[PDB]
């Protein structure tokens, strides 16, 4: 209808699930964006429901540490999500390349992540799929902002009202309440944040096993620890935050607001 008229396609940034991201400019404005080009014809019934949800949910979110959706356009057989341009790749590839972060850089990183999650929550959005793969870096430059992305699995919540919103997310990062098929809500994002912080500081995750059955046992039991030697020189307040985030009871589990007031985030 109206993308072909205002936007000029440019070079490919990446491929995906019947998607192709190109750099684009809004011609008249001159400003440059990322256009996620989705093929309607090759999408499942279920995939359309997500696209619509992703579009609706992303529209609510204006924050410096969320990837902004500026526009969502439906033409014949093709759907275009117009996003902020981000040129730094995934937090994932950066953790792999640097192996692990200092307590300094881990604090700065998760602080931005927690401000992204806090905004989401205050707008009644639970993400459900926090992982390094779904965090992107603004640019290739120094101290570039971490921006939350991929709201394809995100749900809307009314206040603090828990419910069974379905089994959704990434095995390693799922919360015990989801594994227990309990009604859940905002606290599930804070368990994922736990997993991300742990990964940030030693470069491996707190819960693993070849057998998905066993991985889920560990997570439900909160069976993680802080092995020697790599954890020995890591502050007890760093660990204190992880424990407070990796609390198997979501009621006693720390919130985004609380986590940001935690002494390991707040001062330094």
């Amino acid at each position: 209808t109206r993308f072909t008229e205002e936007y000029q396609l440019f070079e490919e940034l990446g491929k995906g699930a019947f998607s192709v991201v190109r750099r684009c400019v809004k011609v008249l404005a001159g400003q440059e964006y990322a256009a996620k080009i989705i093929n309607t014809k090759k999408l499942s019934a279920r995939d359309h429901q997500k696209l619509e949800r992703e579009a609706r949910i992303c529209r609510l979110l204006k924050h410096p540490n969320i990837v902004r959706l500026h526009d969502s356009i439906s033409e014949e057989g093709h759907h275009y999500l117009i996003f902020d341009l981000v040129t730094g790749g995934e937090l994932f590839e950066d953790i792999v390349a640097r192996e692990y972060y200092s307590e300094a850089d881990a604090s700065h990183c998760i602080q931005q992540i927690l401000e992204a999650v806090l905004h989401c929550h205050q707008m009644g959005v639970v993400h459900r799929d926090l992982k390094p793969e779904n965090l992107l870096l603004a640019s290739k430059l120094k101290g570039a902002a971490v921006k939350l992305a991929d709201f394809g699995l995100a749900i809307e919540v009314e206040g603090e009202q828990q419910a069974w919103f379905g089994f959704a997310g990434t095995p390693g990062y799922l919360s015990p309440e989801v594994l227990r098929k309990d009604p859940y809500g905002k606290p599930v994002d804070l368990w994922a944040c736990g997993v991300i912080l742990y990964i940030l500081l030693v470069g491996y995750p707190p819960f693993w096993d070849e057998d998905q059955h066993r991985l889920y046992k560990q997570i439900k039991a909160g069976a993680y620890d802080f092995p020697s030697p790599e954890w020995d020189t890591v502050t007890p307040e760093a660990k204190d935050l992880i424990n407070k985030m990796l609390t198997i009871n979501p009621s006693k589990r720390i919130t985004a607001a609380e986590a940001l007031k935690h002494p390991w985030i707040s001062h330094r």
Binding site: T170, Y204, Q212
Partner: peptide, 16 residues
């Protein structure tokens, strides 16, 4: 110890 590999998003329970 466990090492860090990339994990995919599921939208349903899929026993693996």
């Amino acid at each position: 110890r466990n090492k860090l590999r990339r994990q995919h998003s599921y939208d349903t329970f899929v026993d693996l």
